[PDB]
# Entry
Amino acid sequence: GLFGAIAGFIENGWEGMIDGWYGFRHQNSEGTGQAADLKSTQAAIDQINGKLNRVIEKTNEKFHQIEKEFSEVEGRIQDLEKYVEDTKIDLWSYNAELLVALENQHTIDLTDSEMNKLFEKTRRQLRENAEEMGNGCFKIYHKCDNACIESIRNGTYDHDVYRDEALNNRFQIKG
Amino acid sequence: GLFGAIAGFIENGWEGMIDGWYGFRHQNSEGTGQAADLKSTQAAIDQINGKLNRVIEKTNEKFHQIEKEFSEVEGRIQDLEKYVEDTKIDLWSYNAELLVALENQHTIDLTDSEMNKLFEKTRRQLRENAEEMGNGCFKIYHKCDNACIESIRNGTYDHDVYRDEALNNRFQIKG
Amino acid sequence: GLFGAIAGFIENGWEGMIDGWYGFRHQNSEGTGQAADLKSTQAAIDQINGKLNRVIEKTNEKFHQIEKEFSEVEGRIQDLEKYVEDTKIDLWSYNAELLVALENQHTIDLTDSEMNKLFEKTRRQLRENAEEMGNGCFKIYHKCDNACIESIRNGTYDHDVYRDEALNNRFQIKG
Amino acid sequence: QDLPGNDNSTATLCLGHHAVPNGTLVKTITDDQIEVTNATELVQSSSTGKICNNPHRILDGIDCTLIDALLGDPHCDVFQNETWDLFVERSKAFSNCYPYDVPDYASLRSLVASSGTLEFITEGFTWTGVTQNGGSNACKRGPGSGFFSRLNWLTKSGSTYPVLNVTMPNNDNFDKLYIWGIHHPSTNQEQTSLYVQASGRVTVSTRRSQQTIIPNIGSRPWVRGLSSRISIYWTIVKPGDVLVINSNGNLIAPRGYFKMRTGKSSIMRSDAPIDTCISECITPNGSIPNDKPFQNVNKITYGACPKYVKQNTLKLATGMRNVPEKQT
Amino acid sequence: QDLPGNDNSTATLCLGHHAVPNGTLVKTITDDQIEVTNATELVQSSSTGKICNNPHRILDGIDCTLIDALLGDPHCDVFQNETWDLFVERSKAFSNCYPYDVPDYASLRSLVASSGTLEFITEGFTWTGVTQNGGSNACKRGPGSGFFSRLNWLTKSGSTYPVLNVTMPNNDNFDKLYIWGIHHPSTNQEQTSLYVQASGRVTVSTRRSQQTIIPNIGSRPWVRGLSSRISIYWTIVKPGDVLVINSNGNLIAPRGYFKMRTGKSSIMRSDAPIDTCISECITPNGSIPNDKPFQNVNKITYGACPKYVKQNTLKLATGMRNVPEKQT
Amino acid sequence: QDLPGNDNSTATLCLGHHAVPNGTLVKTITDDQIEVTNATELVQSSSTGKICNNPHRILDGIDCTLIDALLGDPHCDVFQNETWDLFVERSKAFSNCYPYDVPDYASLRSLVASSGTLEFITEGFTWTGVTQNGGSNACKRGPGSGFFSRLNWLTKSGSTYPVLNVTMPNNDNFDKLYIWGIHHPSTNQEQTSLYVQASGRVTVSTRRSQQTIIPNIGSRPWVRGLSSRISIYWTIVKPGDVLVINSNGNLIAPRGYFKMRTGKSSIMRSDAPIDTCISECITPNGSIPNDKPFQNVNKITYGACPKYVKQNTLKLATGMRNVPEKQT
Ligand SMILES: *[C@@H]1O[C@H](CO)[C@@H](O[C@@H]2O[C@H](CO)[C@@H](O[C@@H]3O[C@H](CO)[C@@H](O)[C@H](O)[C@@H]3O)[C@H](O)[C@H]2NC(C)=O)[C@H](O)[C@H]1NC(C)=O
Ligand SMILES: *[C@@H]1O[C@H](CO)[C@@H](O[C@@H]2O[C@H](CO)[C@@H](O[C@@H]3O[C@H](CO)[C@@H](O)[C@H](O)[C@@H]3O)[C@H](O)[C@H]2NC(C)=O)[C@H](O)[C@H]1NC(C)=O
Ligand SMILES: *[C@@H]1O[C@H](CO)[C@@H](O[C@@H]2O[C@H](CO)[C@@H](O[C@@H]3O[C@H](CO)[C@@H](O)[C@H](O)[C@@H]3O)[C@H](O)[C@H]2NC(C)=O)[C@H](O)[C@H]1NC(C)=O
Ligand SMILES: *[C@@H]1O[C@H](CO)[C@@H](O)[C@H](O)[C@H]1NC(C)=O
Ligand SMILES: *[C@@H]1O[C@H](CO)[C@@H](O)[C@H](O)[C@H]1NC(C)=O
Ligand SMILES: *[C@@H]1O[C@H](CO)[C@@H](O)[C@H](O)[C@H]1NC(C)=O
Ligand SMILES: *[C@@H]1O[C@H](CO)[C@@H](O)[C@H](O)[C@H]1NC(C)=O
Ligand SMILES: *[C@@H]1O[C@H](CO)[C@@H](O)[C@H](O)[C@H]1NC(C)=O
Ligand SMILES: *[C@@H]1O[C@H](CO)[C@@H](O)[C@H](O)[C@H]1NC(C)=O
Ligand SMILES: *[C@@H]1O[C@H](CO)[C@@H](O)[C@H](O)[C@H]1NC(C)=O
Ligand SMILES: *[C@@H]1O[C@H](CO)[C@@H](O)[C@H](O)[C@H]1NC(C)=O
Ligand SMILES: *[C@@H]1O[C@H](CO)[C@@H](O)[C@H](O)[C@H]1NC(C)=O
Ligand SMILES: *[C@@H]1O[C@H](CO)[C@@H](O)[C@H](O)[C@H]1NC(C)=O
Ligand SMILES: *[C@@H]1O[C@H](CO)[C@@H](O)[C@H](O)[C@H]1NC(C)=O
Ligand SMILES: *[C@@H]1O[C@H](CO)[C@@H](O)[C@H](O)[C@H]1NC(C)=O
# Structure
């Protein structure tokens, strides 16, 4: 969508992730593992619900209106009675059709955004110790065990702790 | 909003900033200070005004129309006269309600954008001499006095001047 | 637009680029060149066509309706016949005017996006071997001949190959 | 820090989003089939087929149309003084009394249908010099001949039909609806037999209005053994006004007034069954739930209903785009 | 290159945006209360309570309705040849002359109200053999009996009412509106006293149309001492056409024509005071400013007015989201 | 890894987008003139000026209006049993037979115009005791006097006009439209010369309805040598019902029925030339292409047409923003 994460730099989705809408898979010292991110999952879900409720808000009521079916042929007045209703229906139909198209388009960029926002947030947190591989995976240039992965995920990762190890592994090598 | 700066990576607003909508706060070896950015302030304001003017553009005029209040009971024709007006009012009401909702939603992402655009712009200018602390603050890794802060703000900062000092302070240290 | 690339960090367009909507100009050891990018050019064009087709989709047909021109003065019924049509026309006119304004606004951010998406994509591919000059040009810090420029363009550039040369040229120098 | 930080390994962290094997196609500004994770339908397209008799007061008309229930066709006597939020009128309804026609039938049906009450008050009209309570064999009431319960057919007394000139003041604080009529005889002979004058006349007026109708003599098609017709007219008399009925023959006089109220009542043609359940939205196809914003069941509705639309399906995506990881 | 000399230090630069202590809640696609820095109201919900007499030509009807000003009820003689952009009609207005009724009152009020002029031209109709200028005590003009200034009541001369057959050609290049009427007597005796024939008739026609009305005799409710009524009719005669009036009795003849124009004129029922100020938008509640796009004051409007909406407030956010330091 | 690449240099890669020298201004949410690379127009604002005779069946009325083609004015005899998807009615059309008027002309023109056929079936009505086929010099048919091809003017036979009482059952499975009328004489003498009774009467009825009209005697303006008029009325008789025509004089009787269908047919007033070409959308200004979604040619349309809008141009940007590099 507008941000280019979903169906963009993040090649495809994980049918395996049954516990949330956005999340982390990882491969480290102690093996591999997956974990939904619940804050962006809730952020995407709340906006979609808010949107949904506003569309479902109050069917207004109408009681005695005009006749909309006729059994005799009458001419002028019945012609106007049919024309009023036919133009009311075409106007409300254009309205429903434009509404779900703007709505759906927005829902698709809104979730694209939440994805990219989680990506950028993780990026900012890893500071100088990781590099973007460009497919939505960061290469972390220091030993990062499962508690380390869990601190990135729960937003408490301290980059400073690993900066000297990371910078060394990342740059120096032989060039 | 879609960009995640306002009410996102930038934790909260400054009630103290009374001179513009977006701006800078800094702490350097000479003191601390604040300064509104007037270009992004004008960019956000102009779009909102443009938007506003288009909504306020020309009330069209109507003179002799149909009767909208009756004192006797008449049946068929007066039933149609009420149904035409009631469906006109519900259609124009749906229109005003959808209009301000799309409009407001856009105004919120539009200003979110202007914020993030100022952030990215500053980022690009500091080149290799600063790091993002992830809360909308850059750590500048070289001595930057008040004229130096002012050059970043007025867009004339030359990164090259400070590159060797910055790269040293930033990387080398001990890892 | 929302992303700040077009008429933003990319100062202006190239009237010279007659073979696509987005693209690359370069300068390398082998000389200088220009080349349209056809994937983002197709992405921007397809969305705009999709949008266009939906707007042009099916004129619905109407046969016998009400009279819309009168030669005698009749009062009550003819007053209603004029009021129904006048309110139908103002409602469909508001609809056409809001439609092209939302549409156009979106078309402008949609193409702004495609630009910025090509920019970010290129950025991610060059990894540690280039720096953003902030005007939409990357400085590539290693010798990159025409086939090298071609691999960046056709998305097969391997950063690892040039990483040691790049990191050296980029950092070390004298600070 | 610690000491010579030698253990130089790396980790990989990858961000991603879910995908489902199924997925639903929705329309967009730029595409008309894009697949998303999940969607919800906004067009109610199905009725239960039954009119729920709750919360509105539904009055099943059975084989009476509202106008016959109003006039008082014998077979509709069940409906006297009845009230309704919605009068359902059935296609099977029939008339079975003196042949009549109502000049602006549609307005009278309208006006009564939204008054919502058939509450009838009898007034003491005094017709001097004519014979009251005429009846007919086309309007059998029980064994006997009869006529509409609410109208009073006056014919000559002995050898004269005088000029009737009566008045009835509206002294209450509400409007009064008076239904009355005129008799169109088949032959001049029938005219003079019943009303003596060879040309009758009815003038009904208030301070605010007047209607004078003259009968029309001639043969119409045989209907229930008769070629004559009566035509129904109505007069609303506001508080403080006064009815004056003046006739020379052919009057079908009122027996009092219906009271008029203001409410949410209306009438609907439907052969759907009424049933016990609560539903707010009524359609001639039966009630429909009003949880969705739009509906495609029927453009005729009573109560809190979704807005009728031409489309039969409109799906609102309620999830991100589906980009599956294989599809199993 | 640049030679630092001695300083080794860093600086911190932080970007941010303003916030206000107050803030306004607005509705969104995804939220219905989100707080922003500032908003502006789009629904005009209040009237001044006065009809500004500028720029449109407001004609206060005082206690005349437009139809009585048209016919020429004595108490409305002030309105002769008057013109208006908006005729304000007051609830206090009353009629005070011969009891009349206008069959399609609403169309005649409409048609005159948007013509916008009561300019009346007298034509030299010659009625031979009847008595002109009949008047009544229900229409007192000054001390005497009178009648509508613009209509001419003809009764018999001596012992005859001939067959009137007159003509008046439209030779000008504009349409002519002729108002005329018929007299419905209370009793056959009144009929023959005034018009001799026991049944009158009025036929008014052009090359393009014809109307024949026959009087209706009978008693109506006493209004200003009378039980008779006159009913008003209208005939527009296009350029080059010709009026032929033909009657046998009961004619209330025209004295000439009103001219018809085409304009922005209309009529409005309002008891609001007229005042001096300029306002483009008029509502029966008084004028309203038309700076906002929508309004919720009244669905009846004349002039450049905001579109009426059901909502009483709609705020357009004109600032970013309010995320304060402290609280709200 | 790679050995000493002696020269270590850099490259510059710059991303950009096209720009065009020309560019088009479009409206936006935030701006009303922003320049883009390219745009497409959504308002069709021009007609060819010709009504394409394909795919709809256009019937050019030449100098007959549909109602005269219906009644059968001699000069319109060409239109007998004709059919149309669109009947174009020309401003030049004229009537040229006995002066008539149709009380609800607009409904009769409507009802026939969408039936779409003038297919006329003659029925064997038997009028006993009157003289059929009356004609007039205002309705010349060829050398002779004549009358509407589809109506039958009955006058007295010898010294009597009996009471006509005839019937015609609808036994087919479609509705029948019967056009009939009444003759309004100029003078009582004309009345008695033609119809003997000094007051005629026509009553036409089915089981479901009835209309009684009485003639109106008096002089109207001279039209084609006559001061009399006939007024046209219509009666639709449903399957299984029955027409009963009953008269005492002044009847202009039907000669059979028009059949009514249900279709997409209509009528349009236009002096545009018909031409050969296929166009789906017809406007009284000529056909217009329906490729754009909106149109500003005319609010009157027949067929698949763009929605009429007040705007004469609306451009949908179909390209990015134009930010050129040179000057202007
Ligand atoms: C004027 O003409 C109409 C139509 O020609 C005459 O109507 C018909 O009158 C007869 C005799 O009253 C009706 O006959 C009855 O029919 C029923 C069913 O067949 C039967 O039960 C009776 O024993 C009798 O046969 C006939 O139905 C009726 N038809 C219609 C369509 O109205 C009318 O009588 C004529 N009137 C005069 C005064 O000449
Ligand atoms: C036909 O019946 C009506 C209603 O019964 C009669 O109307 C009433 O007629 C009387 C006598 O003209 C009216 O009386 C007058 O009332 C005024 C007001 O108090 C007073 O000034 C007079 O002294 C006299 O009492 C009465 O108002 C009137 N009422 C109504 C509602 O119209 C009518 O007279 C009868 N006509 C015939 C020819 O029998
Ligand atoms: C009732 O009054 C009307 C209007 O005053 C009379 O109508 C006029 O009648 C005369 C004689 O029939 C018509 O004259 C004709 O004029 C044409 C030329 O236009 C001429 O060629 C004929 O030979 C004939 O002279 C005149 O046109 C007609 N005018 C109008 C507007 O209708 C009518 O005759 C009077 N009727 C009675 C019974 O008194
Ligand atoms: C984050 O994860 C680490 C490892 O489990 C734990 O020690 C720390 O307390 C967690 N903090 C929060 C807020 O979850
Ligand atoms: C930017 O700021 C520095 C420090 O005040 C000043 O010397 C320089 O000229 C400024 N340039 C502009 C364009 O303001
Ligand atoms: C990319 O460009 C290089 C240089 O022309 C070429 O060898 C390589 O095969 C290209 N790959 C693709 C997919 O175009
Ligand atoms: C699809 O969306 C609707 C409305 O948000 C929700 O009730 C439903 O549970 C969703 N389906 C799934 C599988 O989440
Ligand atoms: C109808 O209601 C009125 C008012 O309560 C009552 O007097 C009258 O007798 C009722 N008649 C019937 C048949 O219920
Ligand atoms: C509802 O009723 C109408 C008329 O009977 C019918 O055409 C329509 O198809 C029905 N729709 C549904 C959902 O029953
Ligand atoms: C709020 O917005 C309106 C319209 O843009 C503006 O006139 C007003 O001054 C704004 N309020 C403040 C405090 O800026
Ligand atoms: C009305 O206007 C006409 C045309 O100027 C004039 O002849 C006539 O006398 C005027 N009458 C009055 C009462 O103003
Ligand atoms: C305007 O007038 C109408 C009718 O008098 C009243 O119901 C409405 O509340 C009034 N509104 C205002 C803002 O005065
Ligand atoms: C402008 O847009 C229209 C519709 O997309 C297209 O047919 C036309 O070729 C475009 N013009 C150019 C120069 O590309
Ligand atoms: C009109 O059509 C009917 C039915 O085919 C036919 O009997 C009749 O003779 C036709 N008349 C003319 C003039 O075409
Ligand atoms: C179409 O016809 C109408 C009425 O003749 C005219 O006012 C209008 O300007 C015409 N428009 C075009 C595009 O011909």
Summary: The radius of gyration of chain D is 33 Å. Chain D touches chain B through eleven residues (CB under 8 Å).
